[PDB]
Amino acid sequence: ASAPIGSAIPRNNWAVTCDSAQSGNECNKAIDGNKDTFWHTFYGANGDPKPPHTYTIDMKTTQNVNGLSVLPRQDGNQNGWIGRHEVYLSSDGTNWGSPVASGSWFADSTTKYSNFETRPARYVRLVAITEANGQPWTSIAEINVFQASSYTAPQPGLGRWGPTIDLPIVPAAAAIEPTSGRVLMWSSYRNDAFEGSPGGITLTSSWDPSTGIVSDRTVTVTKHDMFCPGISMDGNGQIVVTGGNDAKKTSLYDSSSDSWIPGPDMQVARGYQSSATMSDGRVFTIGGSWSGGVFEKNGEVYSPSSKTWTSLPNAKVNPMLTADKQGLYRSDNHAWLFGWKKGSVFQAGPSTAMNWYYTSGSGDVKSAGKRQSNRGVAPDAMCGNAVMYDAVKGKILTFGGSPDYQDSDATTNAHIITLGEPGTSPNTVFASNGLYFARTFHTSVVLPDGSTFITGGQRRGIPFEDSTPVFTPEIYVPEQDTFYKQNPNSIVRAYHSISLLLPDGRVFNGGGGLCGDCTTNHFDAQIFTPNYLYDSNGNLATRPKITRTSTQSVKVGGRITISTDSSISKASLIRYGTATHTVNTDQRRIPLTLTNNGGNSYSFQVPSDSGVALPGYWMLFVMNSAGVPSVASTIRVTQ
């Protein structure tokens, strides 16, 4: 239920070694081409030495390695499955450096994969750190290593991909847990399938950037299969996850307690809706005909205080529908929603028509004009992305997508929308000359410096298929009104992929697939490390440190004073992100106007308008003159 990115390397001249092997289950039984023979570590009379266990391959010559695979025993024995693991490569066989991949594999007998950026190597080492259910042994029926067609060294200055994080699920939805710094991920009732769900179950997984540990959990307490949901971080600091496979349910993720809490049912059953946090910390949602029925699903609003959903039937979905050939099932999906001033929500697309949504009384909607430029009126851009990279100036960058959800050519179209007051038609212009690569199902994040990182997708949208993939990410730099290609990766990230900004300033990009017995499930993620973390020699740059903050919780309009260990030139606040199905209505950036107190002490004001400084958790980044950001300090913004 997955696949390698390369082609299997012939093994008939390989030499292998293992930390131990039972007689009859020798090390080389894992490479003899026989599914019924297997390597197994010591047991019985030779004792039961516990993991870590290690399998090392000498391929004799250099190969352009981009993955490996492990076929478990196929005789019903479950006690040697590899859980936590690391993959190492070497050119000399003695020094191995950092893992090219690490994480945790699901506990079953299916073939497991580690896919990673191509690297020339002669030696490959798999370390089984744990057995999947905590038993002493490791076994492998067949291990294979895969090679790419070629190898191209990354270009200096264009960032770096790696390592791979191996996961027990396909992470088609994800969020940062702001109080812990971990990445939260979920699939559906199964690790790679949503089809045939009985409801009431979500498999989740987390990755801790500080320890590298991948964990997992089965969530049933909210009686919610959270595949295909709306996602918003509300003003009470809880992630509101709505609908999807259980179309009327609301689940609340609480970062502080790392737990899921039941919420009230929505008034209208929805799937593939967007939701957006508002200036008052409430959550607005509209549309979503993927589940719960296909009909006009107007707005509704969630109050964290009263724990209620209230219908806003006059916040009409009709003005935001695309012209999708498939009709309403698609046309109300994945709105480009942004909470804004005075309880309003701006809808930037994907429909050509942009709209203001209002949340007083029973709701309202007002035309905000068409997304357009001197190049003409922008077509519908389903699963294009929208990123508010300067909330203070109302700036939204939009890009990509296709006129129909499926079987439709994506475009390079890109715009800058500049928001003013609710009820006014914003200025829209074309962004630079558009994307380098037409793409849909791509994902994106705003970076500390205000640039937008754009990655993945495919040129023609075909859910569950990894055709016409785009492997080269792009960064939009607003000050230059220019896009820049970055170094490419090796793993397709199209439908059901996610990206999030990490507190350490790197990008977490993963997922794709989630179609059960399909070959396109990606049980993994990769890190992109932007160029701003590297010095001129390609080594990791020294980062400025925030050595003190006057407070970590601030009201809108409030000031914060900070100390740094070195002089800084710029600072920004970036709201923590959530992601699924190309939608991320939680991220946004505020560039900060600094007062220099001298002696590397600075102060700034959080914007007084909570439609700009949307309540929730934010990352504070400072940047030195060289453009190197600190790691984030977490700030809670309230109103």
How many angstroms separate the CA atoms of 228 and 196, rounded?
Answer: 14
325 CB neighbour count, 10 Å cutoff: 13
How many angstroms separate the CA atoms of 16 and 108, rounded?
Answer: 25
Measured CA angle at 272 (ends 270, 277), to 5 deg: 85
Shortest Cβ 6–Ca ion spacing (Å) = 20
How many positions of this chain bind Ca ion (CB under 5 A)?
5
Q: Return the structure tokens found at 218.
A: 């089965």
Contacts with Ca ion, 111-150, as mask; x by CB under 5 A:
------------------------------x---------
Helix (H/G/I), strand (E/B), else coil: 331: helix
How many angstroms separate the CA atoms of 224 and 232, rounded?
Answer: 16
Is 507 in contact with 455 (CB distance < 8 Å)? yes
Cβ proximity to Ca ion: between 25 and 578 the closer is 25
389 is in an annotated binding site: no
- Beta-carbon contacts of 598 under 8 Å, excluding residues fewer than 6 positions away, are none
Binding residue for Ca ion, selected from 37, 179, 373, 563, defined by CB under 5 A: 37
Binding residue for Ca ion, selected from 7, 34, 542, 625, defined by CB under 5 A: 34
Helix (H/G/I), strand (E/B), else coil: 513: coil
Cβ proximity to Ca ion: between 143 and 286 the closer is 143
With binding defined as CB under 5 A, does residue 259 bind Ca ion?
A: no
Cβ proximity to Ca ion: between 34 and 314 the closer is 34
End-to-end CA, the chain: 47
576 is in an annotated binding site: no
357 is in an annotated binding site: no
Q: Return the structure tokens found at 194.
A: 């949503």
Shortest Cβ 32–Ca ion spacing (Å) = 5
Q: Return the structure tokens found at 206.
A: 């987390």
How many angstroms separate the CA atoms of 630 and 76, rounded?
Answer: 50
Cβ proximity to Ca ion: between 25 and 187 the closer is 25
Selected range binding Ca ion among 32-40, 328-336, 502-510, 624-632, rule: CB under 5 A: 32-40
581 is in an annotated binding site: yes
How many angstroms separate the CA atoms of 177 and 184, rounded?
Answer: 6
DSSP 627: -
How many angstroms separate the CA atoms of 355 and 317, rounded?
Answer: 10
Shortest Cβ 127–Ca ion spacing (Å) = 20
Comparing every residue's Cβ against Ca ion, the nearest one is: 37
Catalytic residue, candidates 43, 123, 302, 495: 495
Selected range binding Ca ion among 23-31, 320-328, 503-511, 567-575, rule: CB under 5 A: 23-31
* Active-site residue flag, 253: no
Tally of residues, the chain: 639
Contacts with Ca ion, 217-256, as mask; x by CB under 5 A:
----------------------------------------
Q: Give counts: helices (H), strands (E), the chain.
A: 1, 49
Selected range binding Ca ion among 33-41, 104-112, 401-409, 598-606, rule: CB under 5 A: 33-41
Cβ proximity to Ca ion: between 139 and 273 the closer is 139
Catalytic residue numbers? 495
Q: Which residues does the annotation place in the binding site for Cu cation?
A: 272, 495-496, 581
Q: Which residues does the annotation place in the binding site?
A: 272, 495-496, 581
Residues at the site binding Ca ion, with contacts judged by CB under 5 A: 29, 32, 34, 37, 141
